[PDB]
Amino acid sequence: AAIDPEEEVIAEAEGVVHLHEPASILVVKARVYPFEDDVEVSTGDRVAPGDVLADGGKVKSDVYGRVEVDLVRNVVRVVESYDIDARMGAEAIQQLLKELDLEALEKELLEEMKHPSRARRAKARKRLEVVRAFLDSGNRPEWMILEAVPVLPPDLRPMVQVDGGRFATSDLNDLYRRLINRNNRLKKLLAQGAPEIIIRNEKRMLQEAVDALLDNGRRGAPVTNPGSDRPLRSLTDILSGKQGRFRQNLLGKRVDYSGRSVI
Amino acid sequence: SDPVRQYLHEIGQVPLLTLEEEVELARKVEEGMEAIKKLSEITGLDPDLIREVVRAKILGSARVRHIPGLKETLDPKTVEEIDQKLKSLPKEHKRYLHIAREGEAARQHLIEANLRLVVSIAKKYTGRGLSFLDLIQEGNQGLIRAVEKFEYKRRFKFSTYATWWIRQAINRAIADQARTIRIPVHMVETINKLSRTARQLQQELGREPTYEEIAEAMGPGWDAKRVEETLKIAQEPVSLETPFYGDFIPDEHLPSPVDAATQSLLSEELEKALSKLSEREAMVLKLRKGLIDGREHTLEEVGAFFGVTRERIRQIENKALRKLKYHESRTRKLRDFL
Amino acid sequence: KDYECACGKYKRQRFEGKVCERCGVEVTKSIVRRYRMGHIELATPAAHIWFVKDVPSKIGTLLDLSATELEQVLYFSKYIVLDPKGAILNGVPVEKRQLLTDEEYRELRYGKQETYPLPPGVDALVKDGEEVVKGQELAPGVVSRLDGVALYRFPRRV
Amino acid sequence: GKAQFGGQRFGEMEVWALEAYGAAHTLQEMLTLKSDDIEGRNAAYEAIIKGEDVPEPSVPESFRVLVKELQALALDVQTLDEKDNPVDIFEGLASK
RNA sequence: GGGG
DNA sequence: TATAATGGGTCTGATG
DNA sequence: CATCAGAGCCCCAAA
Ligand SMILES: [Zn+2]
């Protein structure tokens, strides 16, 4: 075939075709399976030993792997590969935490509190203290993974007009806008079926946005408004330190009916 | 531990396409596109729906979701029903399913194989409001556009067409998500224009241009007033935590103790007037002045609550006020209340 | 504003708890702007960093996951297996909760393959569709690195 | 600050001083009526211009800000009675 | 950057 | 919407 | 032997 009709190699008589001087050869750990009539699997499908490929049930797959239906060759390639379920990110962790029968893990950790060696009794205790922490409270481990991120009421992160008519805004808004952009762009990238390398890069950035909002600077570089090296004031920063909420507003306030002067 | 260096490494895993495999993938993609048109004619289904189900199977069971634009939710149940309605076709039709599949898989490798082009474009839009990565992901969005619009029969190299959509998608993000106060993308163009214009002037004047000099260069329809107003709305907000600057901003909304005091002493010294009047007198005033609904009802609407017309209401009102005016200068309470 | 909807349809305390139909705003004390929470529904889940980086990590120790292993899975550097499905890597079958690098994931999920460029014009020593042993010569200056079906790419001469 | 017509800071150490004196009510008034108890601080003023003894304080608004900033961190803070039944310090303005 |  | 463009710019103490 | 969290109070004018 070709761009335009001319330069199309049209067979002039009856003959047979040979192929020479390939641009490059591509070796492939797969298993060819030629067929005659209609193939029942389509390219992309996963298959294990036994599954029925083509010709109404005759030709079957020996190995394990991935369907690559050729039509130029009339063969059904099966690329050897398992239908493995490995994941990345908090989606994996949230699943494992969901799959934790805490009562079981308490039995097995206690059943290891009887070992010698010092270090083994010690670590079974540090874990059992976390397990028991969840059993006594009623909290589920999978709650340490966020699905719905909460949003602080607006008047606690205000956007107010100052004297000069200019606007002064809390830092939390730019850490929220950061997250909402990365979340929305991820919802759009998913619907548009983007490649893996793109989605994972977006999921990483979504994590890194959640972590700048809850505790900016803890992991990785602190996010900063452009043209100023000031780290944005995350939620953690607001709560803690000498300038934090507890010490600066709960254990000590400013007060009315008071004055000072020289003695 | 460094997101940029991590993504730069992953991108280097996928080898760059040869002019052949560039044309081959672009070709298989366009054929798969047509194979879903011709496949919606046969099956009599929605094209978009079909192309999504083709994606579901090529990508894997990891992704499965309701694609807003489509009409039937995409749960493993309805994709299996449409994957069977597809497999239900004669060899001559069922061949188009293998085409669409082969296309969606080629589309993927074509996107992945061009992620390097997007990096070296976004590297130049650094520090315009968005982070390097935020620029890359925005550029990768135009690359997904360039792949579904690339006509390979024009004999252009793919990089020449993608560069347009990539710039288009980055330049849009900067204009859409870089301001805490979102500005319409056309107004951003004008604000930038005033900026490039003012800098031009400053560089041939040895000083900063006044508003007049800018309105002159901006052209027709531009006076100094609109230059000033355009800058007023082009002002980005300042941080409350700027070393804190927020500590010096008094809250004006919530009323102070003195205000809450006087407002709760005005109502007290006013329902001292709902008595001395009556029940209907001290109610026409509530509708007219808006004590009940918040809005001032004319002597017209008020006429539909007592039966009276627009001139017994007036005497009903003026009898109240004139009586209340005599209750002043005898109690002399309400004077200072200003 | 205290007791008033956005578009000003309702603007008084004769309307308390009513939600305007034009704008959708409740009429109540504007003090609630300090008390009313909102939320963001995430596309995929994200880990609350306090439970990741507060050492010893409460999620890490709960799952017997080292600090490094939690960073790698959470910040997309290694996969963690939730179901091997009979997969095997370099011989040993894939045990669940095992960490795979991106290469070990592709090898198990997509198969292995390699492509070798031939010099321009230099023709092959094998042909299209035939089995090959590792170390088997494919062309004058090209030898294969692994076993499997060999495939031509773009024959220049038919 | 004097330029803002400010109040004086009754910091940590000054609270310790009132605790050491056992001046419980003087301290409570410092942490509510004379600062950020919006309800009590408005009610106090109206009692003093009227000649009535100050009212008993309510909840400091700076504690509500603490509760809400913990909800923003996915942490559920609960004010309970002695029967471990939740007590609303938002007076129903935060629930649906 | 000062005061105590 | 189409030349081609493809990897960045101190100071101490507690705990794993 | 590495990583993280601590490191006095109140007040002024400035920004
Ligand atoms: Zn309304």
Domains of chain B in start order, with CATH, are 1-179 (1.20.120.1810), 183-236 (1.10.10.10), 255-336 (1.10.10.10)
Question: Is the CB of residue B260 less than 8 Å away from at least one CB of chain C?
Answer: no
Using DSSP bridges, classify how beta strands B238-239 and A167-169 pair: parallel, antiparallel or unpaired.
parallel
Helix, strand, coil content of chain B in percent (nearest 5): 65, 0, 35
Q: In angstroms, how far is G2 C1' from A182 CA?
A: 33
Q: CA-based angle C38:C44:C46, to the nearest 5? A: 70
Q: How far is the CA of B272 from the C1' of E1 (A)?
A: 59
Coil, strand, or helix at residue D93? coil
Asked whether strand G has any atom less than 7 Å from the CB of A89, the reply is no
Alpha-carbon gap, residue C14 to C2, rounded angstroms? 12
Q: Name residue B42's amino acid.
A: I
DSSP assigned state of D82: T
Asked whether A65 and A79 are in contact (CB, 8 A), the reply is yes
Neighbouring chains to B with at least 3 Cβ pairs closer than 8 Å:
A, C, D
Torsion angle, alpha carbons of C119, C124, C126, C132, to 10: 0
Rounded CA-CA distance A31/A65 in Å is 9
- Contacts of residue B109, Cβ cutoff 8 Å, sequence gap at least 6: B14, B25
Interatomic CA–C1' length for residue C54 and nucleotide G7, angstroms:
21
Lookup: tokens for C49? 């960093």
Q: How many residues does chain D have?
A: 96
Determined by X-ray
3-state secondary structure of B207: coil
For B235, half-sphere exposure in the C-beta direction (CA atoms, 13 angstrom radius) is 17
Q: Establish whether C23 is an annotated binding residue.
A: yes
Judging by beta carbons within 10 Å of its beta carbon (0-12, 13-18, 19+), is residue D37 exposed, middle or buried? buried
β-bridge partners, B269: none
Please tell me what DSSP assigns to residue C137.
Answer: E
Task: Give distance in angstroms: CA of A152 to centre of ligand 1.
Answer: 24
* DSSP code at position A223: P
Q: Where are the alpha helices (DSSP H) in chain D?
A: 12-21, 24-31, 38-50, 61-71
**From the Cβ of A166, is strand G under 7 Å away?**
no
SS3 assignment, position B127: coil
φ, ψ for residue B93, nearest 5 deg: -85, -50
Is there a contact between C82 and A92 if contact means CB atoms under 8 Å apart?
yes
Residue C128 CB neighbour total at 10 angstroms:
17
Which contiguous run of DSSP H or E holds residue B259? helix B257-266
Rounded CA-CA distance B192/B197 in Å is 8
A28 close to A75: Cβ distance less than 8 angstroms: no
3-class state of residue A170 by DSSP: coil
Q: Residue A249: which of C17, B246, B98, D84 has the closest Cα?
A: B246
Dihedral sign, Cα of residue B62, residue B65, residue B69, residue B72: positive
Is C26 part of any known ligand binding site?
no
Question: What b/e readout covers D52-80, taking b as 16+ CB neighbours within 10 angstroms?
Answer: eebbebbbbbbbbbbbbbbbbbbeeeeee
Gap between the Cα atoms of D96 and D87, Å rounded = 15
Q: How far is CA C19 from the centre of its chain?
A: 42
Cβ–Cβ gap A255/D41 under 8 Å: no
Among C12, C4, C18, which residue's Cα sits nearest to residue B289?
C12
| Cα B268 off chain centre by | 47
> What residues of chain C lie within 8 A of the CB of A211, using their CB?
49
Cβ atoms < 10 Å from Cβ of C46: 27
The CA-CA-CA angle for residues B211, B213, B218, to 5°, reads 90
DSSP element (H, E) containing C113: strand C113-117
Gap between the Cα atoms of D61 and C31, Å rounded: 11
* Residues B261-291: b if buried by 16+ CB within 10 A, e if exposed: bbeeeeeeeeeebeeebeeebbbbbebbeeb
Residue D11 to residue D4: CA distance in whole angstroms: 19
Distance C28 CA to ligand 1 centre (A): 12
**D36 within 8 A of D64, measured Cβ to Cβ:** no
Query: Across-strand partners of C142?
Result: C139
Compute the distance between CA of residue B64 and CA of residue B74 in angstroms, rounded to an integer: 6
Out of B250, B254, B261, whose CB is closest to D45?
B261
Query: Residue A174 in contact with residue C34, Cβ under 8 Å?
Result: no
Q: Say how far apart CA C74 and CA B41 lie, in whole Å.
A: 45
In this structure, are residues A45 and B57 in contact, taking their beta carbons and an 8 Å threshold? yes
Mark residue A251 as left, alpha or beta (left: phi above 0; alpha: psi -120 to 50; beta: remaining). Answer: alpha
Do B175 and B185 contact (CB within 8 A), yes or no?
A: yes
Q: Using CA atoms, how far apart are residues A213 and A230, in angstroms rounded to an integer?
A: 15
* Amino acid present at B12: G
CA-wise closest residue to B111 among B200, B240, B208, B22: B22
Give the end-to-end CA distance of chain D in Å, rounded to a whole number. Answer: 41
Q: Is the CB of C91 under 7 A from strand F?
A: no
Q: Could you give the CA distance from residue A134 to residue A131 in angstroms, rounded to a whole number?
A: 5
The answer to whether residues B337 and B264 touch, using CB atoms and an 8 Å cutoff, is no
Burial B116-147 (b: 16+ CB within 10 A, else e): ebbbebbeebeeebbbebbbbbbbbbbbbbbb
DSSP classification of residue B231: H
Do residues A101 and A107 make contact, with C-beta atoms less than 8 angstroms apart? no
Partner-chain contact C30 B253, CB within 8 Å: yes
φ, ψ of residue B194 to 5 degrees: the values are: -60, -40
For residue C83, give the H/E element and its range: strand C79-83
Give the CA-to-C1' distance from A240 to E3 in angstroms.
29
First-to-final CA distance of chain B: 64
Report the SS3 class of residue C65.
coil
Place of tokens 């089995």: C131
> Distance between CA atoms of C139 and C124, rounded to whole angstroms?
5
Resolution in Å, one decimal, please: 3.0
Breaks (C-N over 2.5 A) in chain C follow: none
Q: Would you call the peptide bond into C56 cis, given omega within 30 degrees of 0 as the criterion?
A: yes
Instruction: Give the closest residue to A216 by CA, choosing from A175, A248, A169, A158.
Output: A175
DSSP label at residue D72:
T
Q: For an interface test with D, which of B258, B259, B263, B269 has the most D Cβ atoms less than 10 Å from its Cβ?
A: B258
Q: How far is the first Cα of chain A from the last one, in angstroms, to the nearest whole number?
A: 101
Query: CB of B31 within 8 A of CB of B37?
Result: no
SS3 category, B140: helix
Residue linked to tokens 């198990």: C108
- The encoded tokens of residue B97 equal 């399913």
Instruction: Give percent helix, percent strand, percent coil of chain C, each to the nearest 5.
Output: 20, 25, 55
Own/partner long-range contacts of B325-331 (Cβ < 8 Å, ≥24 apart): B327/B273, B327/B276, B331/B272
Look at residue B136 and give its three-state secondary structure: helix
In the beta sheet, which residues pair with residue C152? A25
CB atoms within 10 A of CB A197: 18
User: Helices B185-203 & B211-218, crossing angle to 10 degrees?
Assistant: 110
Instruction: Give the span between the Cα atoms of B209 and B191, in whole angstroms.
Output: 16
Q: Are D46 and B254 inside 8 Å of each other by CB?
A: no
Say which DSSP state C114 is in. E
C92 known ligand binder: no
A45-A48-A52 Cα angle (round to 5): 70
8 A C-beta contact, residue B120 and residue B139: no
**H helix or E strand, kind and range, residue B166:** helix B158-177
Instruction: Give the side-chain half-sphere CA count within 13 A for D56.
Output: 0
- CB atoms C31 and D93 under 8 Å: yes
**B1 sits within 7 Å of strand G by its CB:** no
Is residue D86 classed exposed, middle or buried when 0-12, 13-18 and 19+ CB atoms within 10 A define those classes? Answer: exposed
Which phi and psi (to 5°) does residue B99 adopt?
-70, -50
How many angstroms from the chain centroid is the CA of residue A52? 35
Residue that is written with structure tokens 């059993």 in the block: A135
Give the C-alpha distances (Å, rounded to integers) separating D38 from A106, A158, A159, D33, D61. 49, 18, 21, 8, 7
Phi and psi based region of residue C86 (left: phi greater than 0; alpha: psi -120 to 50; beta: remaining): left
Whether residue B88 lies within 8 A of chain D, CB to CB, comes out as no
| CB neighbour class for B95 (10 Å; exposed up to 12, middle 13-18, buried from 19) | middle
CB of B160 lies under 7 Å from some atom of strand F: yes
Six-digit token string for B57: 């199977």
Which residue pairs, CB below 8 angstroms and at least 24 apart, start in A249-253?
Answer: A249/D62, A249/D65, A250/D60, A250/D62, A250/D63, A250/D66, A251/D12, A251/D15, A252/D9, A252/D10, A252/D11, A252/D12, A252/D14, A252/D15, A253/D9, A253/D10, A253/D30, A253/D31, A253/D35, A253/D36, A253/D60, A253/D62
* B58: chain C residues, CB-CB within 8 Å: none
Q: Residue written as tokens 């929305």?
A: A184
The answer to whether residues D38 and D45 touch, using CB atoms and an 8 Å cutoff, is no
> In this structure, are residues C86 and A64 in contact, taking their beta carbons and an 8 Å threshold?
yes
Could you tell me which chain D residue has the CA closest to the CA of A144? D74
Question: Is the CB of B126 less than 7 A from some atom of nucleic acid strand F?
Answer: yes
Q: Are B237 and B181 in contact (CB under 8 A)?
A: yes
Query: If contacts are CB pairs under 8 Å, which of residues 28-67 in chain C contact chain A?
Result: 32-53, 56, 58-59, 61-64
- Strand D79-80 relative to strand A30-31, pairing: unpaired
Which two structure tokens, joined as six digits, stand for B246? 């927020």
Helix (H, G, I), strand (E, B) or coil at B216: helix
Number of A:D CB contacts under 8 A?
77
Q: How far is CA A253 from CA A238, B108, B236, D11, D36, in A?
A: 16, 59, 32, 6, 8
Distance CA A75, CA C149 (A): 12
Yes or no: say if D59 and D90 are a contact pair by the CB < 8 Å rule. no
* Strand stretches in chain A, DSSP E: 20-22, 24-28, 30-31, 46-47, 52-54, 59-60, 65-69, 76-80, 85-87, 145-151, 159-161, 167-169, 253-255
Question: Which CA distances in Å does C82 have to A83, A122, A231, A233, C97?
Answer: 12, 28, 38, 37, 6
Taking the stretch 170-209 of protein chain A, residues with Cβ within 7 Å of any atom in nucleic acid chain G are none
In a mutagenesis test of the A interface, which of D10, D42, D65, D95 is the best target, namely the one with the most A β-carbons within 10 Å?
Answer: D65
